[PDB]
Design a protein around this motif. Structure first.
Motif, PDB file in Angstrom:
ATOM      1  N   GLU A  99     -71.809 -14.708 113.526  1.00 51.20           N
ATOM      2  CA  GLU A  99     -72.816 -13.983 114.291  1.00 51.20           C
ATOM      3  C   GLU A  99     -73.769 -13.207 113.396  1.00 51.20           C
ATOM      4  N   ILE A 100     -73.398 -12.972 112.135  1.00 51.95           N
ATOM      5  CA  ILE A 100     -74.320 -12.342 111.195  1.00 51.95           C
ATOM      6  C   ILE A 100     -75.667 -13.048 111.235  1.00 51.95           C
ATOM      7  N   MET A 101     -75.652 -14.380 111.350  1.00 54.36           N
ATOM      8  CA  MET A 101     -76.904 -15.126 111.357  1.00 54.36           C
ATOM      9  C   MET A 101     -77.843 -14.603 112.435  1.00 54.36           C
ATOM     10  N   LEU A 102     -77.309 -14.334 113.631  1.00 57.61           N
ATOM     11  CA  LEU A 102     -78.140 -13.863 114.733  1.00 57.61           C
ATOM     12  C   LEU A 102     -79.045 -12.719 114.303  1.00 57.61           C
ATOM     13  N   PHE A 103     -78.579 -11.880 113.377  1.00 59.35           N
ATOM     14  CA  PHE A 103     -79.426 -10.814 112.857  1.00 59.35           C
ATOM     15  C   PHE A 103     -80.307 -11.319 111.720  1.00 59.35           C
ATOM     16  N   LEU A 104     -79.704 -11.961 110.716  1.00 58.83           N
ATOM     17  CA  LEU A 104     -80.480 -12.393 109.559  1.00 58.83           C
ATOM     18  C   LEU A 104     -81.584 -13.358 109.965  1.00 58.83           C
ATOM     19  N   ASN A 105     -81.300 -14.243 110.920  1.00 59.77           N
ATOM     20  CA  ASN A 105     -82.312 -15.193 111.361  1.00 59.77           C
ATOM     21  C   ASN A 105     -83.583 -14.485 111.805  1.00 59.77           C
ATOM     22  N   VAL A 106     -83.460 -13.266 112.340  1.00 61.59           N
ATOM     23  CA  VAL A 106     -84.647 -12.532 112.767  1.00 61.59           C
ATOM     24  C   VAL A 106     -85.627 -12.407 111.611  1.00 61.59           C
ATOM     25  N   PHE A 107     -85.134 -12.005 110.436  1.00 67.09           N
ATOM     26  CA  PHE A 107     -86.004 -11.950 109.266  1.00 67.09           C
ATOM     27  C   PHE A 107     -86.710 -13.282 109.066  1.00 67.09           C
ATOM     28  N   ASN A 108     -85.946 -14.377 109.088  1.00 74.23           N
ATOM     29  CA  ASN A 108     -86.557 -15.691 108.936  1.00 74.23           C
ATOM     30  C   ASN A 108     -87.649 -15.903 109.973  1.00 74.23           C
ATOM     31  N   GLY A 109     -87.381 -15.527 111.225  1.00 81.35           N
ATOM     32  CA  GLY A 109     -88.379 -15.713 112.262  1.00 81.35           C
ATOM     33  C   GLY A 109     -89.696 -15.046 111.920  1.00 81.35           C
ATOM     34  N   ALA A 110     -89.636 -13.877 111.283  1.00 81.67           N
ATOM     35  CA  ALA A 110     -90.865 -13.230 110.841  1.00 81.67           C
ATOM     36  C   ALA A 110     -91.493 -13.994 109.684  1.00 81.67           C
ATOM     37  N   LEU A 111     -90.678 -14.357 108.692  1.00 82.91           N
ATOM     38  CA  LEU A 111     -91.209 -14.969 107.480  1.00 82.91           C
ATOM     39  C   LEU A 111     -91.941 -16.271 107.795  1.00 82.91           C
ATOM     40  N   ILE A 112     -91.406 -17.071 108.722  1.00 81.50           N
ATOM     41  CA  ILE A 112     -92.076 -18.311 109.112  1.00 81.50           C
ATOM     42  C   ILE A 112     -93.410 -18.007 109.776  1.00 81.50           C
ATOM     43  N   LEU A 113     -93.458 -16.954 110.594  1.00 77.73           N
ATOM     44  CA  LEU A 113     -94.630 -16.730 111.433  1.00 77.73           C
ATOM     45  C   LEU A 113     -95.877 -16.527 110.586  1.00 77.73           C
ATOM     46  N   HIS A 114     -95.770 -15.745 109.528  1.00 74.52           N
ATOM     47  CA  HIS A 114     -96.898 -15.484 108.647  1.00 74.52           C
ATOM     48  C   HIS A 114     -96.412 -14.910 107.320  1.00 74.52           C
ATOM     49  N   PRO A 115     -96.041 -15.772 106.370  1.00 70.99           N
ATOM     50  CA  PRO A 115     -95.563 -15.299 105.066  1.00 70.99           C
ATOM     51  C   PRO A 115     -96.664 -14.992 104.068  1.00 70.99           C
ATOM     52  N   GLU A 116     -97.927 -15.238 104.408  1.00 75.43           N
ATOM     53  CA  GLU A 116     -99.020 -14.949 103.492  1.00 75.43           C
ATOM     54  C   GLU A 116     -99.410 -13.479 103.493  1.00 75.43           C
ATOM     55  N   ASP A 117     -98.940 -12.705 104.468  1.00 72.70           N
ATOM     56  CA  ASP A 117     -99.237 -11.280 104.528  1.00 72.70           C
ATOM     57  C   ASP A 117     -98.380 -10.546 103.506  1.00 72.70           C
ATOM     58  N   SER A 118     -99.031  -9.837 102.582  1.00 72.52           N
ATOM     59  CA  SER A 118     -98.288  -9.112 101.556  1.00 72.52           C
ATOM     60  C   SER A 118     -97.401  -8.040 102.174  1.00 72.52           C
ATOM     61  N   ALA A 119     -97.929  -7.301 103.154  1.00 71.43           N
ATOM     62  CA  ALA A 119     -97.180  -6.193 103.735  1.00 71.43           C
ATOM     63  C   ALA A 119     -95.860  -6.656 104.334  1.00 71.43           C
ATOM     64  N   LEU A 120     -95.822  -7.869 104.888  1.00 72.82           N
ATOM     65  CA  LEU A 120     -94.573  -8.383 105.434  1.00 72.82           C
ATOM     66  C   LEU A 120     -93.711  -9.020 104.354  1.00 72.82           C
ATOM     67  N   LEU A 121     -94.326  -9.706 103.391  1.00 74.57           N
ATOM     68  CA  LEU A 121     -93.545 -10.375 102.354  1.00 74.57           C
ATOM     69  C   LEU A 121     -92.771  -9.366 101.513  1.00 74.57           C
ATOM     70  N   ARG A 122     -93.447  -8.316 101.040  1.00 71.49           N
ATOM     71  CA  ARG A 122     -92.764  -7.321 100.221  1.00 71.49           C
ATOM     72  C   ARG A 122     -91.688  -6.602 101.025  1.00 71.49           C
ATOM     73  N   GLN A 123     -91.983  -6.284 102.287  1.00 70.28           N
ATOM     74  CA  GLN A 123     -90.998  -5.615 103.128  1.00 70.28           C
ATOM     75  C   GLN A 123     -89.767  -6.490 103.323  1.00 70.28           C
TER      76      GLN A 123
END
Lengths: 731, 40, 109
Positions: free
Chosen positions: A363-387
């Protein structure tokens, strides 16, 4: 804090008094709020701002409700939320503090206002709720006795708790009632499951009401009572979580498509702003609690979050269809990036609160996957990538036990996919290389093994061998902190190795030596298959890198490194061949699975060994001339390869796919000719191959039944390889 | 204590439910009469 | 056990040439590990939506499929070479130990 109470109103003994302060005097508060910023000084040195601040501070400490009454009640009768919230923000940012009683009264009044607005539908209800939630997260900043359990219990008792917290579970309406365009027409009652888009409901209502397809786009469902125009792809249960006896009443209204799209854009924008406000509120709530109770609060938050039915979808899903709209897409995207960043911050804050040895399952994935969901959406944004990089580093450092064993199998897939998919963007590649270097520092070899395991399924819409080689090359050196990713990590800046057991720099050759061992440990295993695939994809790149290094500089020392590396690689491959002796053994859907599993490791070994020898052998003579030829492969290794090829031939005639094996054909017609068969020691390997070929052809000739379905072009290439070997050496 | 409080509220609103039964039976005429007028 | 120095078990494979330097890695980690220039197309919203939907479906599949003393015990087991292995010779993963356990623990209006 003695100065935070009405001193003179507390000392008096307590043995009624009525206060007459009409609402038209309370209006004077706003001018004083503005005056707080007036710096003019009287001739005797008294400043207007100081006097105003003192007066309003005294008023707030003495009686918060009396001063903050004419605003709270007034907002109900008019849609002036913006002005009042602006004034309250100015009050907060000019007084610089709120005493416990003042913030308590303000928070209770605001919560009651939200409860009333949801309670009694009004034209400007949702806008008012959004505006209030946009600021509630600051009022919660200064509250003392706010605990999760009490808040949850009381707000649930009120039962309209889904508009404040995000960890709220409420079964939605089972059925929905909708009226048509006309009046008094036969309405319709329709079922509602837990995964129903409004698109299906709109389609069913449209078809049931006998509407032409031409004007399909002109009809939209909307809620007249709350004055809501509904988006096609929003779940029924999310907009109507209340499971009451009364189903929500909808209406099928006709209007121009452009106006409908504009209204939908506005309403989804307001709702997304509300959701951001709720997330901010929870962040502020969980960022002020005694450290003793913080662990319990975070454990409770994790439990409620896990038990929520559709959390990963709620936090990851986005309304993609509306982004393409030119008029309003940009604003929605800009507000969604902020929502995703706040979600990442929430999960990272929750993670740090919990202990370092929490027993985690899948079930850890259920949380970690959230990060992935953001990274896929728009990884070119520096503010999100560094965070994202900082939060992942924090999680890795804080979960020593988990991340040292099997913890990188959830994060690295998406990171590698994006790394490979955005080669054109140097910033993204540099940031991901910095992150990978940091992980390597944190976990040393286990991280590399888990990286290989994660990248094996995607080796070629997949990560190419060149991308993996570039990543390893970057790992080979040091990378500067171009976005200062280390700013947000919470740990000592030296970032020494997590395990005491492990000061060395990752090297490709070392990695290869590390990889072969895995195959040696469990040669007959799927993980061994993955490692073999990784080696096949990697070694040629290493050889090309060595060739390029030789080309760059002609000095002898470069040659010395080349011979040293070649010898090390030869030793590693010899060890692999010696330790993979198990594979020597010979031998509807299950049959196919067995067929493929039998095939893959032997073909991978043949490919790797043949490519290695073919590339090196000729290079040895030229390099030595440029500079005592050392045997790359010992006789025993040659026998191991020959026996393996024999095993492949054993099954070759039965299955066409084995006959067409690329690795087998390559070994037979491109590896036999190069080895020097002059030594009697190596000859039996060739004798064995010839014996199997002879037996195979005798079997083919014995019965025509096999001859009917046998493919001969692979046999033609096989004979071509045999005669090529005969031609190369007449002995 | 919580159980008895819940029971008190529930029985009070059950009396209100009977009151609604009466009132709704009274009011269930006007809307359907208007429906008939619209049809007519 | 806490008094004695730490010395974790390490991976060792005998049947290799003497010239191979086996890499240093914990045995438990290995065991659990084995037990289990144009990018315009990618940044198009359709492929992004497809990837997000794939992630959501994976999360749905995971949903459908679904203290200090124990941690210290496991830490000690990994820490010391002879822990939980009676008489230092029985073997914590020996068939005879399993037989003894099953026979002793066999139990049955």
């Amino acid at each position: 804090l003695i100065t935070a109470i009405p001193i003179t109103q507390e000392a008096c003994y307590e043995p009624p008094p009525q206060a007459v302060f009409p609402a038209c005097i309370c209006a004077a508060v706003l001018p004083i709020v503005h005056l707080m910023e007036d710096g003019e000084v009287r001739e005797d040195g008294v400043a207007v701002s100081a006097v105003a601040q003192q007066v309003l501070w005294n008023c707030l400490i003495e009686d918060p409700s009396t001063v903050l009454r004419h605003f709270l009640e007034k907002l109900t009768i008019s849609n002036r939320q913006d002005e009042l919230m602006y004034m309250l923000r100015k009050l907060l940012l000019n007084i610089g503090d709120f005493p416990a009683q003042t913030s308590h009264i303000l928070f209770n009044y605001l919560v009651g206002l939200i409860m009333y607005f949801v309670r009694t539908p009004c034209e400007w209800g949702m806008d008012a709720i959004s505006a209030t939630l946009t600021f509630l997260w600051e009022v919660v900043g200064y509250v003392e006795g706010l605990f999760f359990k009490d808040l949850k219990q009381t707000m649930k008792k009120e039962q309209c708790e889904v508009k404040l917290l995000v960890t709220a579970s409420m079964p939605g309406t089972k059925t929905l009632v909708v009226h048509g365009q006309n009046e008094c027409d036969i309405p319709t009652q329709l079922p509602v499951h837990e995964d129903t888009q409004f698109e299906a409901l709109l389609k069913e209502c449209l078809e049931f009401f006998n509407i032409p397809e031409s004007q399909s786009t002109h009809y939209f469902l909307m809620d007249k009572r709350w004055n809501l125009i509904h988006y096609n792809k929003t779940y029924v249960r999310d907009i109507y979580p209340f499971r009451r006896s009364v189903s929500p009443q909808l209406n099928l209204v006709h209007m121009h498509p452009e106006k409908g799209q504009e209204l939908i854009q506005k309403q989804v924008f307001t709702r997304k702003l509300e959701e951001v406000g709720r997330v901010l509120f929870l962040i502020s709530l969980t960022q002020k609690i005694p450290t003793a109770h913080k662990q319990s609060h975070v454990s409770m938050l994790q439990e409620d979050l896990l038990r929520l039915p559709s959390f990963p979808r709620s936090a990851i899903d986005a309304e993609f269809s509306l982004f393409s709209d030119p008029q309003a897409g940009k604003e929605l995207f800009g507000l969604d990036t902020l929502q995703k960043s706040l979600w990442i911050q929430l999960l990272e804050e929750m993670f740090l609160g919990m202990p370092s040895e929490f027993p985690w399952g899948d079930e850890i994935m259920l949380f970690l996957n959230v990060f992935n969901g953001a990274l896929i959406l728009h990884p070119e944004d520096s503010a999100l990538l560094r965070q994202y990089a900082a939060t992942v580093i924090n999680t890795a450092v804080h979960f020593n036990h988990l991340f040292s064993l099997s913890g990188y199998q959830w994060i690295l897939p998406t990171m590698l996919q994006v790394y490979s998919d955005y080669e054109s963007n140097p910033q993204l590649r540099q940031a991901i290389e910095f992150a990978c270097h940091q992980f390597y520092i944190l976990h040393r070899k286990p991280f590399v093994l888990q990286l290989f395991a994660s990248v094996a399924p995607l080796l070629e819409k997949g990560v190419s061998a060149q991308c993996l080689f570039d990543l390893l090359q970057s790992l080979e050196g040091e990378t500067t902190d171009i976005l200062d990713i280390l700013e947000l990590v919470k740990a000592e800046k030296p970032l020494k190795s997590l395990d005491f057991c492990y000061d060395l720099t990752f090297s490709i050759s070392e990695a290869i030596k590390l990889c072969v061992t895995v195959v040696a440990y469990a040669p007959e295993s799927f993980r061994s298959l993955q490692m073999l695939m990784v080696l096949e994809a990697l070694v040629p790149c290493y050889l090309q890198k060595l060739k390029r290094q030789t080309s760059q500089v002609e000095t002898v020392p470069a040659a010395r490194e080349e011979i040293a590396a070649t010898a090390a690689l030869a030793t590693s491959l010899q060890a692999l061949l010696y330790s993979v002796e198990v594979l020597t053994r010979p031998m509807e859907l299950d049959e196919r699975i067995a067929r493929e599993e039998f095939r893959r490791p032997r073909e991978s070994l043949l490919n790797i060994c043949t490519e290695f020898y073919k590339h090196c052998g000729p290079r040895l003579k030229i390099l030595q001339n440029l500079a005592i030829a050392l045997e790359l492969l010992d006789v025993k290794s040659h026998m191991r390869l020959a026996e393996i090829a024999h095993s492949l031939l054993k099954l070759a005639p039965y299955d066409t796919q084995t006959m067409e094996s690329r690795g087998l054909r390559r070994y037979i017609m491109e590896m036999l000719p190069i080895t020097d068969w002059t030594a009697e020691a190596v000859r039996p390997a060739l004798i064995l191959i010839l014996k199997r070929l002879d037996r195979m052809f005798n079997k083919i000739h014995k019965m025509p039944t096999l001859r009917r379905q046998v493919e001969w072009e692979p046999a033609s290439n096989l004979i071509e390889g045999v005669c090529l070997t005969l031609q190369r050496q007449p002995i | 204590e919580q159980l008895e409080y819940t029971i008190e509220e529930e029985v009070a609103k059950q009396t209100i439910r009977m009151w609604l039964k009466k009132c709704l039976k009274r009011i269930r005429a006007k809307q359907q009469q208007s429906c008939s007028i619209i049809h007519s | 056990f806490e008094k004695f120095p730490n010395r974790p078990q390490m991976v060792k494979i005998s049947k290799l040439p003497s010239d191979f330097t086996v890499p240093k890695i914990r045995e438990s980690f290995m065991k659990q590990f084995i037990d289990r220039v144009f990018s315009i197309r990618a940044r198009n919203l359709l492929e992004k939506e497809t990837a997000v939907t794939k992630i959501l479906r994976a999360c749905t599949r995971q949903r459908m499929l679904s203290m200090k003393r124990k941690v210290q015990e496991e830490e000690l087991r990994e820490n010391h070479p002879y822990f939980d292995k009676p008489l230092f010779i029985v073997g914590r993963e020996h068939r005879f130990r399993n037989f003894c356990r099953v026979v002793v623990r066999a139990r049955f209006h």
